[PDB]
Design a protein around this nucleic acid. Sequence first.
RNA 1: UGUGUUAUC
Length: 400
Amino acid sequence: LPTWSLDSNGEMRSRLSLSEVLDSGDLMKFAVDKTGCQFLEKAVKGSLTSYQKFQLFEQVIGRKDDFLKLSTNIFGNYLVQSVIGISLATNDDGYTKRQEKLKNFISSQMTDMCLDKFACRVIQSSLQNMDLSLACKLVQALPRDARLIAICVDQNANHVIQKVVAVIPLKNWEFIVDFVATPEHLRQICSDKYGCRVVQTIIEKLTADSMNVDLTSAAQNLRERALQRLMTSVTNRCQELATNEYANYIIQHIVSNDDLAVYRECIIEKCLMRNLLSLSQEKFASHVVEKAFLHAPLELLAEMMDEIFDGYIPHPDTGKDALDIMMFHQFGNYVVQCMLTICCDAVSGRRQTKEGGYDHAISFQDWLKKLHSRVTKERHRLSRFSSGKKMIETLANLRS
RNA sequence: UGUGUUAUC
């Protein structure tokens, strides 16, 4: 801090005025100092005269180098955001030029700012607060090459993409959907901790749910086509994604969401059916298998149940079957518990059994009897395990 | 008995 602003204690004077700082030419020293920026931040929330605003506009968001220096600063980024807000609230003759400047500064350094822990906050608040037509121009400044992957998997920058998805119409960011849907990009992004969150947010925004009822029918058509293109790519890589440590959450999201029912069915047919025994023994995919049981339409659920009960040839020596393997497997046991709970819910009326012009209660009763008979026969071994005690208790509670 | 994301003074 400039000496003029310090007391005899070597500490920022109290009773300092905003205008003194603005007049001094020393704002940049205050804005990058914890105490100095705290003062500016409080000062700019109060009444400001036209000239005070003018000075703040010039000094904080008026020149490219200083704008970038504050935007990328741990303290300064807050002041930048405050001054952008004041700029947008001040409809004098300078309004247009100030916002165009801000758009040019950010666009010209878009990737660098998105990747920065602090400047990415400036980007997000600009996207949601600036006039929409100018915010759309920021989106246009996003890179279209390998840097876009870098942004999508970055701990900071992924939040910029999620903000774009939230507050900008789809036509402006449709290019991101197609970028992410490219096979090699999908693989990289979905297999990343942050990238997987970005893809789920995109899918959510492309879903025709109660949150999108305000779209025009033309916008719904745009959305439906983008969703269909993304789902095609996800479905093409379903097996790889379902078994992955992060992308399994995406596959689960799709399978679990009734508003994605047509895609849920594709996924189940494409990579789960005929692979249930194998996938139920996988750490990540076993959760996908549970979601499929829980949400499959009746005709597919029947195929799934039939696969577990009768889809596999028992061991040639021991006679162990798929149910035997799954009941005692470290991951498979949860899938069998899920099957049992579904059947108990159906027969007790906690789950609707009518669908497809028929009451399928008879099917659930059949599957339940098979599970009950197995659990009865194998009660001694099952009672050795928490999972087995749980199934025994589940069946006991049903009788009650 | 079994997995992640939700990030600044």
